[PDB]
Amino acid sequence: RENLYFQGSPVEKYNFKAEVNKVMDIIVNSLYTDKDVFLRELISNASDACDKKRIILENNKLIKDAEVNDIKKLIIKIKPDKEKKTLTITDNGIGMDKSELINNLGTIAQSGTAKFLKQIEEGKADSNLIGQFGVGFYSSFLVSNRVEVYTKKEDQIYRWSSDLKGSFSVNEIKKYDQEYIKGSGTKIILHLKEECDEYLEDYKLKELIKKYSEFIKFPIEIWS
Numbered sequence: 510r511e512n513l514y515f516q517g518s519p520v521e522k523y524n525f526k527a528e529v530n531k532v533m534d535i536i537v538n539s540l541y542t543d544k545d546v547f548l549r550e551l552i553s554n555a556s557d558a559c560d561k562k563r564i565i566l567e568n569n570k571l572i573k574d575a576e577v578n579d580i581k582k583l584i585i586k587i588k589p590d591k592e593k594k595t596l597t598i599t600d601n602g603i604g605m606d607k608s609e610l611i612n613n614l615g616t617i618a619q620s621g622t623a624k625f626l627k628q629i630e631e632g633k634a635d636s637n638l639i640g641q642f643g644v645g646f647y648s649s650f651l652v653s654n655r656v657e658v659y660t661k662k663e664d665q666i667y668r669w670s671s672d673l674k675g676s677f678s679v680n681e682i683k684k685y686d687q688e689y690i691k692g693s694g695t696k697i698i699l700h701l702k703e704e705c706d707e708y709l710e711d712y713k714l715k716e717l718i719k720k721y722s723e724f725i726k727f728p729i730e731i732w733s
């Protein structure tokens with residue numbers, strides 16, 4: 510009897526596997542973690558997303574030619590906003606459609622996270638060592654109360670949001686013409702934990718970009 514809308518579209522809420530959510534909570538909120546790695550992980554995903562776009566564009570062209578460009582614009586952008594307490598990482602890479610977004614981001618036990626958890630379980634790894642593994646996107650929760658993802662694959666924009674407390678939400682944004690992701694891309698908005706405002710600082714971002722960028726072959730732009 511209660512249908513939910515956000516920005517003009519119905520909101521679909523999905524539950525995480527409860528047990529997994531429980532343990533994920535422990536590792537991202539654990540004391541003595543290397544919280545900095547969240548940026549390593551997101552930049553790594555942004556680079557992969559640009560690589561995927563480049564490769565698919567090249568193949569498309571081959572097939573368009575045979576019958577029957579902006580690869581140069583590929584970039585990763587990082588924007589702190591001290592007043593809103595947000596850090597935003599944006600790529601103009603492949604993006605995700607609704608389905609990929611629910612199935613890809615909607616499952617916590619990824620490859621690296623599952624690995625880590627199993628080692629902990631087998632007594633082979635300490636539970637504060639999230640950094641020692643490549644857990645990917647969900648590492649954003651090392652430093653965030655809430656995470657949003659706005660991603661466009663082809664003419665449609667979808668928003669994913671979660672505070673990692675049992676569920677995530679997905680809804681379409683029909684008129685995202687309020688913000689100029691051009692062709693495709695993914696915009697990740699981190700709503701930072703109170704104790705994590707140093708990630709709003711220019712010198713800190715630069716330091717991390719330098720530590721985690723050495724092998725990333727797409728330009729990274731830090732605003733301010």
Ligand SMILES: Nc1ncnc2c1ncn2[C@@H]1O[C@H](COP(=O)(O)OP(N)(=O)O)[C@@H](O)[C@H]1O
Pocket residue numbers: 554555558600602603604605613614619620621643644645646647694695
């Ligand atoms: N920035 C991004 N752009 C496009 N797709 C993205 C993305 N960040 C994550 N994704 C998709 O979500 C999936 C899950 O991400 P993650 O949990 O970091 O797993 P991973 N590091 O093993 O790839 C990725 O494999 C990728 O397909």
